[PDB]
């Protein structure tokens, strides 16, 4: 029993964290095989012009107490790729994946190439992450683990004026309408990840919390009218299908759980909590709930 | 900026997780140097669980009864001893991934990371606090016994907890790495109940300082209070008494934010009286008590 916000074990990623220094800037890099990936703002803009002026010896790469030698440099979108002479012996089985809003991933927050913390979080529908990052955290990565394969999905680049965070996939493409330049940027109005709230309501039922359940069911169209009104993301037939296994395990049809969510949005919690929370949690996907309420290992 | 519940990176602990099998029971072990530590109840059958004589059950065991698996490699048990509720299995191979480590016993209110494992394989990492009633509110399924709680402060892993049991309310009980249980619990299936839980007051205050450091000030007030008056109010909301030690520990956060501890205590009193009124503090509608003053200064 119990339900916690749980991150993937970070060991496979810790063995890839390196420190990257160029000029006065120091941030984190991801050392995979003979390449170190890091935010291109470490050279800081005309990034092509700035990069052509740099030579390999300008980039100081440090893996533990060992300095790696840069033998090449190239740029792919907002990520800088520093070719090094040594392949990382600790390189796990990995792939670069771009995630969708609502999907969750674990973040290994680093400072000076040294991992300091791991937390679980979701790509908000406005493409920001509500992370916890200080100066020096740039280059920290977001990932998921599937069997023994690490899926790198995020690299930290910047903090928006509201304290929320913006970054790219490992191919340097930003999530959201953000740029890696000093300019006025604002995160759009955020919405709640509806499929994730429903998954978390199923986790609460699996843990014996049933007070919010009701005899009612709704149509998907009637629920989506309510979802729009309360700044909740639309629920698609895909989401309903993905929630299928949880619906089967708990005996509560997805549209039956939607009528519970609808009542919760219109009436509130009334001094009650769900899984120790007075708010509806939207940072557990349907897969996260199945994984935690079944015990899948890595 | 930003404030998250953050666990320590689990890599140093993952390299120590092994699977321990004795008869029909399989749970997790902690492989450090040439010793594997695990809950002593791995030697029990389900008919032994009510009133087990662990000394008597262990004397009947031999080294080859204990199957230890580190990855796809079986380790050979060359000795076994018991220290309180932990079983120590001497093995013929020192773990090459053994980090710099120490065994520390923690106090209620202290936080730590948990590497939840099943069959010697890590599946998740989360942040926990030792509750004032000596239980932990974990996320543990059957097979999680032997999963460990730890803190990583400067390359050294401090092992502080090993999971042993789930109480009828879904909360968890376990021991330090010397086998001494936290709380009045025993590793028997006899009727056991967690005492009434209370909120870790010093941790809530630390989290209110983190909220101020992050620019949230709506809950602050012009009032101060005496320590005794704060404790008389707080106890009525099932909050732990705040000692002069807690006030002293909050000193650095009080200095950084310019808000005296007894002034923050008055803001807490008011929050307890009024509730949040549809507002949140650091994205939470409840007062968070699983961030110590040390966690706040570290993260901020
Ligand atoms: C890399 O520096 C910047 C930054 O956001 N840094 C940060 C990233 N994370 C957490 C932070 C916590 C506190 C202080 C800064 C943080 C600030 C300067 O402007 C820029 C900029 F124009 C583009 C850019 F991609 C990054 C940055
Ligand atoms: C042998 O493990 C036991 C147990 O609690 N295990 C568990 C530990 N964690 C999460 C669990 C989730 C669901 C089911 C069991 C869980 C079984 C019950 O009896 C006992 C017992 F009297 C003493 C003991 F130290 C352990 C246990
Ligand atoms: Cl699923």
Walk me through this protein's architecture.
Chain B: Residues 1-300 are cytoplasmic. Chain B: 3CL-PRO exists as monomer and homodimer. Only the homodimer shows catalytic activity. Interacts with host FBXO22; this interaction promotes the proteasomal degradation of nsp5. Chain B: It is found in: Host cytoplasm; Host Golgi apparatus; Host nucleus. Chain B: Residues 1-300 form the Peptidase C30 domain. Chain B: This is 3C-like proteinase nsp5. 2 copies of one chain form a homodimer. With 298 residues, the first copy, chain A, is of the alpha+beta class. The first copy, chain A, folds into 3 domains: 1-14 and 93-190, Thrombin, subunit H (Beta Barrel), CATH 2.40.10.10; 15-92, Trypsin-like serine proteases (Thrombin, subunit H, Beta Barrel); 191-294, main proteinase (3clpro) structure, domain 3, CATH 1.10.1840.10. Chain A is 23% helix and 28% strand. Chain A has helices spanning 11-14, 47-53, 194-206, 220-229, 237-242, 244-250, 254-267, 286-292; strands at 17-22, 25-32, 35-39, 59-63, 66-68, 70-76, 79-84, 93-96, 104-111, 114-122, 141-146, 149-159, 165-168. In chain A, the strands form 2 sheets. Chain A has a 7-stranded antiparallel sheet, with no helix packed on it. In chain A, helix 3 (194-206) packs parallel to helix 8 and helix 4 packs parallel to helix 7 (254-267). The two termini of chain A are 20 Å apart. At the A-B interface, helix 1 and strand 10 of A face helix 1, strand 9 and strand 10 of B.
């Amino acid at each position: 029993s119990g339900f916690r916000k749980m991150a993937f074990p970070s060991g496979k990623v810790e063995g890839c964290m390196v420190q990257v220094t160029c000029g006065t800037t120091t941030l984190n890099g991801l050392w995979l095989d003979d390449v170190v990936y890091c935010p291109r703002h470490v050279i800081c803009p005309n990034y092509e012009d700035l990069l052509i002026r740099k030579s390999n010896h300008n980039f100081l790469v440090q893996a533990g107490n060992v300095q790696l030698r840069v033998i090449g440099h190239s740029m792919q979108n907002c990520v800088l790729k520093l070719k090094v002479d040594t392949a990382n012996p600790k390189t796990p089985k990995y792939k670069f994946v771009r995630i969708q809003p609502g999907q969750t991933f674990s973040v290994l927050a680093c400072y000076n190439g040294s991992p300091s913390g791991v937390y679980q979080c979701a790509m908000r529908p406005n493409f920001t992450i509500k992370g916890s990052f200080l100066n020096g955290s740039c280059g920290s990565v977001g990932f998921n683990i599937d069997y023994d394969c690490v899926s790198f999905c995020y690299m930290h680049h910047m903090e928006l004026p509201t304290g929320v965070h913006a970054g790219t996939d490992l191919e340097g493409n930003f999530y959201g309408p953000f740029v890696d330049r000093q300019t006025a940027q604002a995160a759009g109005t955020d919405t709640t990840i509806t499929v994730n709230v429903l998954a978390w309501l199923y986790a609460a039922v699996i843990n014996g919390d049933r007070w919010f359940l009701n005899r009612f069911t709704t149509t998907l169209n009637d629920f989506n009218l309510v979802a729009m009104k309360y700044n909740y993301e639309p629920l698609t037939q895909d989401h309903v299908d993905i929630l299928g296994p949880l619906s089967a395990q708990t005996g509560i049809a997805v549209l039956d759980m939607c009528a519970s969510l609808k009542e919760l949005l219109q009436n509130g919690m009334n001094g009650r909590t769900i899984l120790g929370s007075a708010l509806l949690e939207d940072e557990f996907t349907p897969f996260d709930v199945v994984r935690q309420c079944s015990g899948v290992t890595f």
